[PDB]
Amino acid sequence: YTNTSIIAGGRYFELLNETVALKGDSVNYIHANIDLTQTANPVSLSAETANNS
Amino acid sequence: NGVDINNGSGVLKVCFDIVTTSGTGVTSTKPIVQTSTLDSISVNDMTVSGSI
Amino acid sequence: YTNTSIIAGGRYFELLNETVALKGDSVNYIHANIDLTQTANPVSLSAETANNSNGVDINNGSGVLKVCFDIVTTSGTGVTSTKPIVQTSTLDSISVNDMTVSGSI
Amino acid sequence: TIKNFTFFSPNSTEFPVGSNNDGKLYMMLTGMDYRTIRRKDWSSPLNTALNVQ
Amino acid sequence: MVRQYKIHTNLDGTDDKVWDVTNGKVRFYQPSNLGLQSTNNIWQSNGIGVMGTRSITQPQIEFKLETFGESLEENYQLMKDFVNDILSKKFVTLEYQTEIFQVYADLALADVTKTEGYGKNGTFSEKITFDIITKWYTYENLTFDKIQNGKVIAGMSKIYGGTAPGNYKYIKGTSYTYYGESDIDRLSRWDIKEEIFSFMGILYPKLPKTPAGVRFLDDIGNEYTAIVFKTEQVQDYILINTDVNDETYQGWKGTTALNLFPVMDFERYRTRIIEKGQMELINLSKAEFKIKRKADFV
Amino acid sequence: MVRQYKIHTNLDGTDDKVWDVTNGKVRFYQPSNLGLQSTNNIWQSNGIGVMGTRSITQPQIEFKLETFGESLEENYQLMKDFVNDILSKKFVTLEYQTEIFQVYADLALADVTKTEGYGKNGTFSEKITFDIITKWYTYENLTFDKIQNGKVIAGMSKIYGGTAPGNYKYIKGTSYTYYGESDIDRLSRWDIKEEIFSFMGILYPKLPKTPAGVRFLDDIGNEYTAIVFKTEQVQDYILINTDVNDETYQGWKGTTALNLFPVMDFERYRTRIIEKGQMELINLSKAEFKIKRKADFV
Amino acid sequence: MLEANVYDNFNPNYYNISDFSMPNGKKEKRGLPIPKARCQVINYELWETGYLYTSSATLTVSVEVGDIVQILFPEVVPIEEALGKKKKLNLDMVYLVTDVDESNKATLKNYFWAMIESLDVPNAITKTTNFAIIDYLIDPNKNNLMSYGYFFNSSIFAGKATINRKAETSSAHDVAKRIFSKVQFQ
Ligand SMILES: [Ca+2]
Ligand SMILES: [Ca+2]
DSSP: OOEEEEEETTEEEEEESOOOOOOTTSOOEEEEEEOTTOSSOOEEEEEESSOOO | OOOOTTTSOSOOOOOOEEEEEOSSSEEEEEEOOOOOOOSEEEEEEEEEEEEO | OOEEEEEETTEEEEEESOOOOOOTTSEEEEEEEEOTTOSSOOEEEEEESSOOOOOOOTTTSOSOEEEEEEEEEEOSSSEEEEEEOOOEEEEEEEEEEEOOOSSOO | OEEEOSSOOTTSOSOOBOHHHHHHHHHHHHTOOSSOOOOOOSSOOOBOSSOBO | OOOEEEEESSTTSSSOOEEETTTSSEEEESOSOOSEEEEOOEEEETTEEEEOOOEEEOOOEEEEEEEOOSSHHHHHHHHHHHHHHHHHSSSEEEEEEOSSOEEEEEEEEEEEOOOSOOBTTTBOEEEEEEEESSOOBOOEEEOOEEOOOOOOOTTTSSOOBSSTTOBOOOOTTTSBOOOOOTTGGGOEEEEEOSOBSEEEEEEEESSTTSOEEEEEEETTSOEEEEEEEOOSSOOSEEEEEOOSTTOBOEEEETTEEEEOSTTBOTTTOOOSSBOSEEEEEESEEEEEEEEEOBOSOO | OOOEEEEESSTTSSSOOEEETTTSSEEEEOOSOOSOEEEOOEEEETTEEEEOOOEEEOOOEEEEEEEOOSSHHHHHHHHHHHHHHHHHSSSEEEEEEOSSOEEEEEEEEEEEOOOSOOOSSSOEEEEEEEEEEEEEEEEEEEOOEEOOOOOOOTTTBSOOBSSTTOBOOOOSSSSOBOOOOTTGGGOEEEEEOSOBOEEEEEEEEOSTTSOBEEEEEETTSOEEEEOOBOOSSOOSEEEEEOOSSSOEEEEEETTEEEEOTTTBOTTTOOOSSBOSEEEEEESEEEEEEEEEEEOSOO | OEEEEEEOOOOHHHHSOOOEEOTTSOEEOOOOOOOSEEEEEEEEEOOSSOSSOOEEEEESSOOOTTOEEEEEEEEEEEEEOSSSOEEEEEEEEEEEEEEEOTTOEEEEEEHHHHHSTTOEEOHHHHTSBHHHHHHHHSOTTTSSSOOOOOOOOTTTTOSBOOOOSTTOOEEHHHHHHHHHHHTTOO
């Protein structure tokens, strides 16, 4: 993600040259994960086997 | 009231005699029925004065 | 048993926050067991696979009196139903004014 | 906990039976609740005007 | 003070010659191992350990057997008398005794050595090896317990006393506590506190042609096993032994010993292993029991 | 300074009798091996080596067990006490303590020796062998972490301050950074930083009939395992132990202990091994955890 | 180690009865029970489909012949049941206990192959599409073991069934093997 902005749960963040590793021969569901207890890095991305919203 | 005094707190009130009166004195008296709640009875003979 | 009173073999006792452990997916027969030789604790409760009431005369002789008072049915996780054992009154001759029967004579 | 009553106490302290403990016992023997009573007149009660002795 | 070892031919029996191996002419010295070994079946997957069932194995006991005769004739006479006494009985009971404990082992003679390296006056230094049947078991005396009637006290017990027609008062804590029971002498508990394997109970029956024997009750008052015999005449005493190795059942009348096994109730006798609870006497005036329960390490 | 060895009958349990094998009357000396062995499964093709998976194997620890009694009576009394206490519990926990670490091992009695070579006042010098269930695990108290609001600073924080009607400036780098969150007392993280194997949690449930128990979240906020029970009445505390050897899932109410195994969700409880992430409390008012985590060599 | 859920035999003489009262009101087939014991699997060889070899594992609880063993994994498998529809399926390895030795090492047979056991199929059924054979093979009214319906990808079993040798009566095992070889699925 070269320059993508996302609003999730009313929280704004930017993906600037953020790479997500994928599973081969698969349908990858890209998720934005917000954990407010992780003070320094509250947002992380994941590639999952299903839509786990 | 039927207040459980043996287990909990409170004042137990229970009627035993009904007294019908006039202006002067007592006209008639009727006692409250003594209920005997039981699960099963094995009896030889019985006599009923009222009804079953 | 939060507050249950029982009379077994003419002996009165109270079950005050007394817990009995049960067998899963089973019909549990709850018994009151009276052993007079156990001076400090003559009464104990058991959950059994059958009604093992023995009719032992504890007031005239030796032995342990076992009497079933409750039937507790379970699933694999908890109690599904409870049925009490019938309380029998054996009498010779009765004089009565009125009677109500919910079952049958 | 199991509270035993109709049992002897060797040290004369083990199983004391109180008024409420016997009260509950008597109720079970005759088959009565707190809404009914057991009453017997050994001698008929006298009626003097608006009073019943 | 010091440890006493004793070898018994028929422990729990009348024909029991005892060999004082600690004190006597024939002596047991330096036991190989009196401890125990266990195989716990511990399998581990990814560093985390799972434990199976521990088979508590008992190792052979090897003693340095020395003889203390006065002549070559006396030492040869000891070795012949001692070793054959061990051979005459199928198994020989050892006794481990100290200031604190007295336990027993049921050894079976595995190996004995005889060599021509004689010390003074033809003395012997030999190794005697034993195989274990049961390692450490107590031989306690089991007796019934009696129940006593509590004392009568004014105001605390249930009596109609003082001013006529009597009075008993309800009080918080004191109230009415029953004194005892009319004929409390009818209650006798033969208490079983720990699990037992074998026992040597002598039982004297009351009435002939009435099933005579002992029954066992668990903690909830249910019967698990019962040694019940039916007899035509009254045998002065029934001498039952539950030991597996030399199981003995016999009804003694006078000087005659009769085998009571075929006349015993096979359905009631479900197990030999006695569980925690109590024992009841059926058709018995008197009984004397000798209980023998285990101890893995002592 | 010096090393401390301690034997625990039931670590993580109220009935925990501790034996000081460094200081006490019964002492452990000269451990055989405290290290480890590994089988790497190395198969070689044409001189080139390919490595499989390393099965880290733990070897038996043999201690020179010495007793320090004052009389023959006391030394016999120690050997009988110490060995039977180890036998009473299916497995014993060792405590390897030093200036830098405090690790524990789950031992099972492999072999104990008893001989008649007594030193002074009936002293004992015997070898005790143990089988390894789990070797070196840290036993630590796991607690949640709290989040606190950052301080408010003029020009740095998002506030409309100073001259009316309030002013917040967009700067380069310093700009506006939020102070904290309203009710930041709601945020609590039970952090899991390294992979844990077993745990002894005391769960305090809130609402009856609602699945009460802990669930585990991975690094992406998904659930892998959950120990969840659906009770009929409010238990005062649920006691859960994940130890493989003695699993406990009991709901205590007053003085009564209830087995919670059939009421548990079997589908949600996928694994015992807890991974890096966070723990969530389902229908719980309070929680108290004790985490045990393995270490191969220490 | 791996987590295992041990259940007693999924007897279709018991579970294939529509007497379970659903919360809405209507009657459905008896649901699977709770595991009689939760144990852990050690010293194992576990096969996903059981195409060539039969599985083996030493279990902590003393399992007996007939019991069903559900091996659990803390991961999820996404299966596409409809063109666009995908469902969150938890990873499982389900087997039937065939034999347990003295050391409690259980010989595990994959549930499907243990279900289509002793079942014979005539040439008349092999005449239609592969869907008809799958619908015949998976039926709790005929099978030795209980089954609550199959999930199948239409595209792979769309083709016409393979021609039988001598047009004889073949076993459910031989036909499945012949079909699974051509469709390239297990
Ligand atoms: Ca003998
Ligand atoms: Ca423990």
